[PDB]
Every structure is written in C-alpha cells, then in structure tokens.
Amino acid sequence: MTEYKLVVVGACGVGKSALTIQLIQNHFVDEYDPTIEDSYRKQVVIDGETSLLDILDTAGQEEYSAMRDQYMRTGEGFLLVFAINNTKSFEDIHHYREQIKRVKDSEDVPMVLVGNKSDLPSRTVDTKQAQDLARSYGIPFIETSAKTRQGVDDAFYTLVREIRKHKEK
Numbered sequence: 001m002t003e004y005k006l007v008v009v010g011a012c013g014v015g016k017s018a019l020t021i022q023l024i025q026n027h028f029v030d031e032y033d034p035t036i037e038d039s040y041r042k043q044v045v046i047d048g049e050t051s052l053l054d055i056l057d058t059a060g061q062e063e064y065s066a067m068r069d070q071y072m073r074t075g076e077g078f079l080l081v082f083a084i085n086n087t088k089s090f091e092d093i094h095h096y097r098e099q100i101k102r103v104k105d106s107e108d109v110p111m112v113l114v115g116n117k118s119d120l121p122s123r124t125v126d127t128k129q130a131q132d133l134a135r136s137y138g139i140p141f142i143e144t145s146a147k148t149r150q151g152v153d154d155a156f157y158t159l160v161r162e163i164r165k166h167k168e169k
C-alpha cells in the first residue's frame with residue numbers, strides 16, 4: 001500500500017494537533033496536550049489512489065538533537081502551519097523553510113503553506129501576504145479551520161499531490 005510521510009510544523013497554538021485530529025477522527029479538540037509529538041496513520045483515497053498517510057504532529061520542546069533532525073528528515077512533505085490571528089507564527093514560517101532545506105539537503109521539498117483558524121474574526125495576517133509568500137516559495141497556500149473543517153482535507157491532499165509531483169522528477 002502506498003505510504004506518504006507528512007510532517008505538520010508551526011508555532012505553538014496554530015492548530016497542528018487540531019488539524020491532525022480533524023483529518024483522522026472528524027472531531028474538533030478544544031484542548032490537545034502541547035507536549036505530545038507523535039506520528040498518526042490514516043488510510044485515505046486521493047485521486048483514486050488508496051494510501052496510508054503517516055502524519056507527524058510536531059510538538060514539545062524546540063531542540064535540535066541529531067535524533068530530532070532524523071525524525072523531521074523522514075518527512076516527504078511538510079505542512080507549514082501558521083494561524084491567521086498570530087503574526088509571529090507567520091514570521092516563523094521562514095525558519096521552518098530553512099530547517100527543512102537543512103535536514104532534506106534540497107531546495108525541492110514538497111510543502112504546503114496552511115493559514116489556520118480561518119473562522120476567527122481577529123485576523124492579523126492578510127490572505128494576500130500569505131498568497132504572496134507561498135508564490136515566492138513556489139508552493140500551494142490553503143486556508144483552513146480545524147474548528148469548522150474548512151480546507152482540512154484540501155491541505156493534506158494537496159500536500160500528497162505535491163509529494164507525487166516530486167516523485168515524478
């Protein structure tokens with residue numbers, strides 16, 4: 001069975017755990033322990049292909065042991081998650097671009113930019129700024145809400161399609 005290793009990165013509180021549990025269980029979590037980093041499995045059909053998604057929900061401490069590098073390096077594609085109400089989380093995306101390029105030793109790593117919490121009225125990051133950033137990176141941008149499930153399937157399935165594009169090269 002085809003398997004895709006996805007890694008969900010981004011600042012505390014952007015909704016990485018909530019997006020992951022939405023994808024898997026179709027339920028929105030109000031509280032998800034921010035100390036729990038682990039990989040989940042979900043069988044999906046995308047464009048007619050049955051596959052297993054292995055989803056690393058990143059969490060815990062920001063630390064850079066060789067073991068942590070190796071966990072992140074297993075990723076075939078990365079969801080770059082910020083929250084539309086958190087400017088700092090948006091400013092953190094550049095850091096994640098640098099660390100993914102470092103561990104994958106590549107300027108061609110499958111990635112999707114995800115603007116989460118699209119349901120909140122307290123926007124501080126304009127859609128235009130996120131679209132411009134994703135364009136500059138050559139990657140898709142998806143607006144999501146883990147609360148309403150807006151965009152959740154599209155974010156993960158688009159990442160799988162980016163990995164397929166890479167595998168073709």
Ligand SMILES: *CCC(=O)N1CCN(c2nc(O[C@H](C)CN(C)C)nc3c2CCN(c2cc(O)cc4ccccc24)C3)CC1
Pocket residue numbers: 009010011012013016034035058059060061062063064065068069070072073092095096099100103
């Ligand atoms: C609230 C808990 C949580 O979800 N997480 C804690 C913060 N974590 C990371 N944060 C950052 O940078 C933050 C957003 C901004 N800082 C203050 C500059 N960077 C990382 C993590 C987890 C570890 N990440 C990491 C580590 C190694 O060794 C290698 C690679 C390679 C590619 C991507 C990340 C990465 C960096 C996690 C979330």
Ligand SMILES: Nc1nc2c(ncn2[C@@H]2O[C@H](COP(=O)(O)OP(=O)(O)O)[C@@H](O)[C@H]2O)c(=O)[nH]1
Pocket residue numbers: 010011012013014015016017018019029030031032033034116117118119120144145146147148
């Ligand atoms: N309103 C709203 N709240 C969300 C959304 N995604 C996550 N949250 C909430 O934001 C908080 C942080 O979510 P979590 O998934 O723990 O973020 P993580 O630290 O990135 O794993 C939790 O209270 C969630 O219920 C979203 O799209 N909309």
Ligand SMILES: [Mg+2]
Pocket residue numbers: 016017018032033034036057058059
């Ligand atoms: Mg979490």
